[PDB]
Design a binder for these strands. Structure first.
Lengths: 215, 101, 154, 84, 128, 118, 60
RNA sequence: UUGUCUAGCGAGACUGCUAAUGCAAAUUGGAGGAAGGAAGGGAUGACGUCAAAUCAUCAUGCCCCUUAUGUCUAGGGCUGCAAACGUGCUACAAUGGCCAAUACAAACAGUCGCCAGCUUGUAAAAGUGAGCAAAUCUGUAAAGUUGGUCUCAGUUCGGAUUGAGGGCUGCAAUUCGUCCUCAUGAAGUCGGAAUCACUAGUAAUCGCGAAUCAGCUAUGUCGCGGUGAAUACGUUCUCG
RNA sequence: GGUACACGAAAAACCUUACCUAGACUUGACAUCCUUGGCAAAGUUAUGGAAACAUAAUGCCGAGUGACAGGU
């Protein structure tokens, strides 16, 4: 079908999820096989964290895991129990050879990000929720909270029928023909008792032409 | 002094991110020391990763992701104490890796 | 339905000063090289003044002027017994067809080293002995043979 | 050939063939592989080699120094061509 | 006056120094003979074409250093360099050298070879 | 020993046809035996022809070459073995496919219709 | 046999002829990248998510 | 006989101003200019079409074994062969072939490697001896070209294939990595009904590196390139 | 046929691999929990074997028991 914006207009306009580099076939294998697990865990284990994006920051066996979240208290928490829990989890998933020093930072109106919307929609789908009402509420919450037009499509089973007829939403200006529009994208896989349902959301962060690279 | 003529190459995965570090080195090295070689671009020995789209038959259309291993050579010809003090504490962005002698 | 497109003609061969020369060099193209067909054409001219003596420039321009065709035939069919209808073409395709004819009748032959065979081929095509002039005569004579079907043009 | 450790045997197929060649010619041994480099010290005996199937006993010969055991074990069969 | 140009035809890179001095205009491409650098074919005069339009081998001494291209590739490199130095002499002759298609780079270079395109543009086929 | 063939090309090239002496060992002879190239020359000297047929035998005798080849073919085909088995059927033995290939030993093509299904 | 693939990657008793590299998440050493230790489409979706250094659609 | 260079940006190219047409928009010409008007390539692939491909990323709904379809080492096939599509290479040759040398990169890879230069060699290579985590040090860049020959031959095309013996890596190289000293000169001397890709670096074509790989009968392909045209009237056949 | 083929495959000595025959393996080869510690066993060189598989042998590190892990 259509291309995904988070790979189309990426690398020139949007900041990387993982900022690291190295020479060829020396040590990039471990880093690339390691960053994905942490990225997936930050959305699966900490569902309530509401991470707009995790900034993986690796340079010669040291990682500075940054998080952009609406409230630090999701991962910082009261009495610093959330911070120690997340630090120990990421340390056990990263080993003792790499420091963590993770930080959580506020991001301006995180609803203009796609990862949280995709993850929450997947959790709703795999929780056996009415798809119509859940999609309506997600669209309302993502349009009302200060974000521009949205482009949501849920493919797979529609909880009873319409398997090959994916429910695709189109709101506001969503030009994939544009190459600088800050159309953030994220795909997620809901593991429900009907298999896996794929949710993809394009969210407009405001046109990114001549806007730089920082997310 | 303090390891003179320290050949510090810089390589990154982003285009502007590495030239930014090179310019930061060339500007921070001045004001405390003069006549230092600045931006010295290299062939930037990158690699191209060709990946197919479908999990099944496709080879006439397999797009490439470009882990562009850029490369800028930074050579200090005047290695006064302030120049290399700034050099060792350039504090490049984390996406930048320095090969220093 | 695409229409008239901006076809481009590259700079002439700057060792003989003729665009037809470079077109011939780039139509008999083997292995992709022009340093190849340039040597081919130079040796062909050398053997031309060796056997069947004639000035390369005059003979080349005469061949270019003469071997060009007159019209083209478009295939037309309705129910059965398909036929041809005359049509006019710009001279660019005429000299292109001359290029293709020379390449096809030169690159393939026995009768050893290619130098003398291509020299003989171009000389025969030049002096109106049938190697490409026969096609020009036929396409004129073809229109008056199937004129009963040529008239049926829409 | 291999030309770099190209005359190596796993030292466990080698033991049985060394013993059996020197008894008189004893054929059956439970040394099944394709890695036994042929040397003139293995003459007269057969190996229960692995053709991708059960241990088939094939008569090994020793003429080359780089050719190997599986040279004597069949691994592919004829076409047995059919008209349709 | 010495003119400095840019020769990058066929993904090349060249320095030229056009000096209209008493020198005839010897083409010193990488400091070796053109007989081995180039064939004696159209290329041996394709290299001199910029001189051919500037009083061939009687003016504009061509001190040219190059890297990039083959035999006609290097000739094209020096050609673009010489014509661009001529343009640098006076920023008004770009129009008249545009017609010859030597300067005003027509981008004639083996473009980015695509995935699935074997001749760098040829698709396998419309497979039956 | 060997078959004497006249030359229209150089001597090495005339040797390329005969069995046991090919394009490369005759090249070695030509670079080592100081053989005059044949510029439209039928032959420099006849007496050397058969002599050349022996000099390449310094590397490996052509008769010995063919004798060893045939002896290995028969030995490794008669006994239980693989290389001789694939050689006797006239198919490639050094790992060349036969699905749409290996027909360099099967002849150009022997078209026979195969099984068709609905 | 995804477990078999990874275990055959890891365990080597005394024969290092069984050497190769593969993805530690989904195996499939066919079309793997020893540069990145990962298969093809998983790499592609990871880069689409933006978690891979250098992400663009055939920019050359 | 260095500010090309490599990589970033700015000016710029954006109908900018003029004339013209077009009720509009929009288009053509002319200046500066890299291009005069989406500037050549790539990406950008909309509802849905084939209920196309995939349970083979993975997740798995369902259907399937569990002290056993899990795991496993070892070995073998995945290069079988009468056969038929398709990709290229490579040739059907003298534009070339073999022999020796030569110029060039865009670049990319390389510290069981790349190896300069050098010794042996008809070599996969046997090694001496700098340098390089990589514009240095290297990977023949070659085709092109230079000099001899070949006189259009089943050919000095084409290296396909196979055996006597070795070489790179890897416990093991026969099968299934491989190539070479030596052998071979297959088929194919221009390709049927029927067609596709391909419009300025396009096809065609020749190279350097590499993806998996311990290593590779990838000649390929993937990236970068080197040589390098023509046509495109027009929808008449034609197809979406 | 489009919607597959120098394809998914960007490598076929075994691995890569999915089958093949040859060997053990029974919470099992790996793995969550139960269970037991400071000396604990993946892999080691001989060694039947081709190697698991028992070994003599070593790493703040691990074995068995039923629930379970695994599935190109």
């Amino acid at each position: 079908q259509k291309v995904n914006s988070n790979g189309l207009r990426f690398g020139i306009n949007k900041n990387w999820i993982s900022r690291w580099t190295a020479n060829s076939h020396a040590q990039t294998a471990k880093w690339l096989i390691e960053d994905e697990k942490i990225r997936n865990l930050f959305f699966v284990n900490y569902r309530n964290a509401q991470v707009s994006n995790v900034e993986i920051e690796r340079t010669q066996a040291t990682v500075d895991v940054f998080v952009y979240a609406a409230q630090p208290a999701f991962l910082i928490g009261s009495e610093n129990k959330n911070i120690q829990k997340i630090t120990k989890q990421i340390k056990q998933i990263i080993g003792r050879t790499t420091n963590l020093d993770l930080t959580i930072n506020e991001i301006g109106s995180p609803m203009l990000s796609a990862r949280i919307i995709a993850r929450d929609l997947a959790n709703a789908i795999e929780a056996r929720v009415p798809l119509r009402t859940a999609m309506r509420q997600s669209l309302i919450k993502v349009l009302k909270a200060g974000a521009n037009g949205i482009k949501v499509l849920v493919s797979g089973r529609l909880n009873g029928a319409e398997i090959a007829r994916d429910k695709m939403y189109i709101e506001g200006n969503m030009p994939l023909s544009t190459l600088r529009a800050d159309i953030d994208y994220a795909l997620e896989k809901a593991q429900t008792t009907y298999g896996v349902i794929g949710v993809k959301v394009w969210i407009n962060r405001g046109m990114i032409y001549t806007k730089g690279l920082n997310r | 002094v303090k390891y003179p003529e320290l050949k510090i190459k810089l390589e990154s995965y982003d285009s502007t991110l590495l030239d930014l570090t090179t310019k930061k080195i060339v500007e921070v090295v001045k004001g405390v020391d003069v006549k230092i070689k600045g931006p010295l671009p290299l062939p930037t020995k990158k690699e191209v990763i060709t990946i197919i789209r479908s999990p099944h038959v496709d080879k006439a259309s397999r797009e490439q992701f470009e882990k562009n291993r850029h490369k800028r050579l930074m050579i200090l010809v005047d290695v006064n104490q302030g120049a290399i003090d700034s050099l060792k504490r350039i504090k490049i962005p984390v996406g930048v890796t320095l090969r220093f002698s | 339905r695409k229409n008239r497109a901006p076809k481009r003609t590259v700079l002439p061969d700057p060792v003989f000063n003729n665009t037809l020369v470079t077109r011939i060099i780039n139509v008999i193209m083997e292995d992709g090289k022009k340093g190849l067909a340039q040597r081919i054409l130079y040796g062909a001219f050398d053997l031309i003044e060796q056997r069947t003596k004639e000035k390369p420039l005059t003979v080349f321009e005469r061949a270019v002027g003469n071997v060009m065709p007159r019209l083209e035939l478009r295939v037309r069919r309705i129910a059965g017994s398909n036929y041809q209808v005359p049509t006019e073409v710009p001279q660019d395709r005429k000299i292109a067809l001359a290029l293709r004819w020379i390449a096809m009748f030169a690159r393939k032959r026995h009768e050893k080293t290619m130098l003398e065979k291509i020299a003989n081929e171009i000389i025969d095509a030049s002096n109106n002995t049938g190697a490409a002039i026969k096609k020009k005569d036929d396409t004129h004579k073809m229109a008056e043979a199937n004129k009963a079907f040529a008239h049926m043009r829409w | 050939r291999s030309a770099k450790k190209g005359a190596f045997v796993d030292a466990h197929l080698l033991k049985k063939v060394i013993d059996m060649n020197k008894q008189e010619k004893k054929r059956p041994i439970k040394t099944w592989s394709r890695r036994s480099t042929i040397f003139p010290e293995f003459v007269g005996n057969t190996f229960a080699v692995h053709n991708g199937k059960t241990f088939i006993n094939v008569y090994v010969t020793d003429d080359m120094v780089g050719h190997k055991l599986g040279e004597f074990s069949p691994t592919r069969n004829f076409k047995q061509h059919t008209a349709n | 006056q010495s003119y400095y140009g840019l020769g990058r035809r066929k993904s090349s890179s060249a320095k030229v120094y056009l000096t209209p001095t008493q020198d005839k205009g010897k083409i010193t491409v990488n400091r070796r003979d053109p007989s081995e650098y180039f064939p004696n074919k159209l290329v041996i005069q394709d290299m001199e074409q910029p001189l051919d339009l500037t009083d061939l081998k009687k003016n504009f001494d061509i001190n040219v250093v190059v890297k990039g291209g083959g035999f006609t590739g290097q000739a094209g490199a020096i050609r673009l360099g010489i014509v661009r130095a001529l343009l640098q002499f006076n920023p008004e002759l770009k129009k008249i050298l545009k017609s010859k298609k030597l300067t005003t780079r027509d981008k004639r270079v083996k473009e980015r070879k695509k995935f699935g395109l074997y001749g760098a543009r040829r698709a396998p086929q419309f497979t039956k | 020993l060997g078959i004497d063939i006249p030359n229209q090309k150089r001597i090495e090239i005339a040797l390329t046809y005969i069995f046991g002496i090919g394009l490369s060992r005759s090249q070695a002879i030509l670079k080592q035996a100081n053989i005059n190239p044949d510029k439209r020359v039928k032959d420099l000297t006849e007496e050397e022809f058969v002599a050349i047929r022996n000099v390449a035998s310094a590397y490996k005798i052509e008769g010995d070459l063919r004798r060893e080849i045939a002896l290995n073919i028969k030995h490794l085909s008669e006994i239980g073995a693989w290389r001789g088995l694939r050689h006797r059927k006239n198919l490639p033995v050094r790992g060349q496919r036969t699905r749409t290939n290996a027909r360099t030993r099967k002849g150009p093509r022997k078209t026979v219709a195969n099984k068709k299904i609905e | 046999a995804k477990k078999s693939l990874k275990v055959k990657q890891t365990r080597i008793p005394k024969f290092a002829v069984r050497a190769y590299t593969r993805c530690q998440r989904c195996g499939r050493a066919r079309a793997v990248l020893s540069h990145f230790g990962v298969c093809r489409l998983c790499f592609r979706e990871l880069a689409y998510a933006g978690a891979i250094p250098g992400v663009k659609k055939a920019s050359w």
